[PDB]
Design a protein around this ligand. Structure first.
Ligand SMILES: CN(c1ncccc1CNc1nc(Nc2ccc3c(c2)CC(=O)N3)ncc1C(F)(F)F)S(C)(=O)=O
Length: 130
């Protein structure tokens, strides 16, 4: 379905989420993935443009004339790979699987990746649990 947008243009309600769904299916099938992110010896295939769109850190890396060419990117090996995996899934789905047992790792990872809305959200949820 569609609706008359605030700019009087036709707007498709599911388009942005459908695009993201299709990009995640591409990732799942390893279609047009152009970077491997390595975290504590675990490898995650992804699309640079998606990473840049969601993360200040990846935005800086991939707009850098030298680093934009890299097909492998290593992160700090103290980063929790599950924390990364949760955030990568968030980038591709809008869904953040936050839990008692993962929230600290997720927040630390989001801080490192410069995903500020996620960091804020983790903070609010930590403060609620005080
Ligand atoms: C429309 N669908 C398809 N038709 C033909 C081929 C593939 C698909 C679905 N899969 C994908 N589809 C796309 N893009 C895409 C494609 C076909 C159209 C559209 C988008 C809009 C459209 O009207 N046809 N991108 C990635 C994938 C995926 F999952 F493989 F990684 S469907 C669900 O099977 O009815």
């Amino acid at each position: 379905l569609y609706f008359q947008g605030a700019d009087s243009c036709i707007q498709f309600t599911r388009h942005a989420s459908d695009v993201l769904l299709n990009l995640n299916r591409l990732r799942s099938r390893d279609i047009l993935t152009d970077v491997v992110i390595v975290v504590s010896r675990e490898q995650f295939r992804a699309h640079k443009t998606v990473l840049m769109a969601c993360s200040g850190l990846f935005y800086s890396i991939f707009t850098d004339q030298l680093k934009c060419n890299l097909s492998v990117i290593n992160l700090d090996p103290e980063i929790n790979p599950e924390g990364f995996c949760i955030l990568l899934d968030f980038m591709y789905t809008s869904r953040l699987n936050l839990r008692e047992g993962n929230i600290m790792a997720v927040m630390a990872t989001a801080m490192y990746l410069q995903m500020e809305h996620v960091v804020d959200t983790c903070r609010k949820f930590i403060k609620a649990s005080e």
